[PDB]
């Protein structure tokens, strides 16, 4: 078994690598979960309450807002670039 | 087994390499989940609450509301580039 | 078993390259599941709630709205490129 | 087993590179979670509350509003880059 | 086994090199989590209580607010650069 990545460079570049190599309630085993990985702005309210929540006579009232003046701006997300111009202007 | 990837260069590329090489309630077992990802504005509101949850006389009223002035400018997600002009003007 | 890609470059190439290569309630099992994997405004309300969720008399009253200006803009997604000229004027 | 990776170089690369090389209530056993991670306002209300919550009798009310004026500004992202221009200008 | 990274080098890179390597209520084991982890205004907001929380006759009322002016400018996050200009002006 052989991996040969980007043996000979003359030059500049502008690279993003990533290798994996193998050989061989909520339950995980044996697993890569998040290489490389980008989130913005992820919400999450319930989860994994438990084994007997609110088993007998519950009265639950569940409310959920989301507003507001939010803004986001990203010029280059994951995009490596050479010989180049990049900008932003407010 | 071989592999061989990008062995020779000469300039200035911009490059996005991932290899993956093998040999051989919710359960998951022996994966890979996320590579590259990207994920922007992403909502769960309940999930897996649990084993017996409301089991006998629930009065429940969900509400779930979504509103708001958001916004998401973005000038290259995922996309190398080379030699080039990037730009984002307000 | 050989695999050669991109053995020789000369110039500025712009590339996105993923190689895999293989030899041999809810469940999963031995699996890839995101790779170069791109979400906007993903939403789930229930999921997975639990084995026996409102097994007698439940009165539920289950309501989801979701509304307000939102705005996305981009401008190459998963588009490498080389010797242009990407822009975004508001 | 052999992996090269970027075995010569001659110039300024701006690289990123990560190797992985193997041989062989909520759980987790035997796995890689978060290489070269990003997260941008993450939220997260209730989690793993207990085996048994609220079991009898229990008014509960609950109510989230996530709002106000917020703002994100990011030039480069998981983005090497080589000979260019990377600004923000408000 | 043997694993060769950025043998040689004649110049000014800018790298970020990560190798692993590898022979062979909530519970963890045999893991490695962050490595490279950038986070960023992240909540939490309950997280796991207790074994028996509010077993009998509670009342409760839970509010959650997130307002307010906030502001995060980033010029360059995990993206390594040569022989280029990188400013943020104000």
Do not use: C, Q
Not at 59 to 85: C, H, K, M, Q, W
């Amino acid at each position: 078994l052989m991996v040969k990545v980007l043996d000979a460079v003359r030059g500049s570049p502008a690279i993003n690598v990533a290798v994996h190599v193998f050989r061989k309630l909520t339950a995980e085993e044996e697993f890569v979960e998040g290489i490389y990985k980008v989130e913005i702005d992820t919400k999450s309210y319930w989860k994994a309450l438990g084994i007997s929540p609110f088993h007998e006579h519950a009265e639950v009232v569940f409310t959920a807002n989301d507003s507001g003046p939010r803004r986001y701006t990203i010029a280059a997300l994951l995009s490596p670039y050479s010989y180049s111009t990049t900008a932003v202007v407010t």
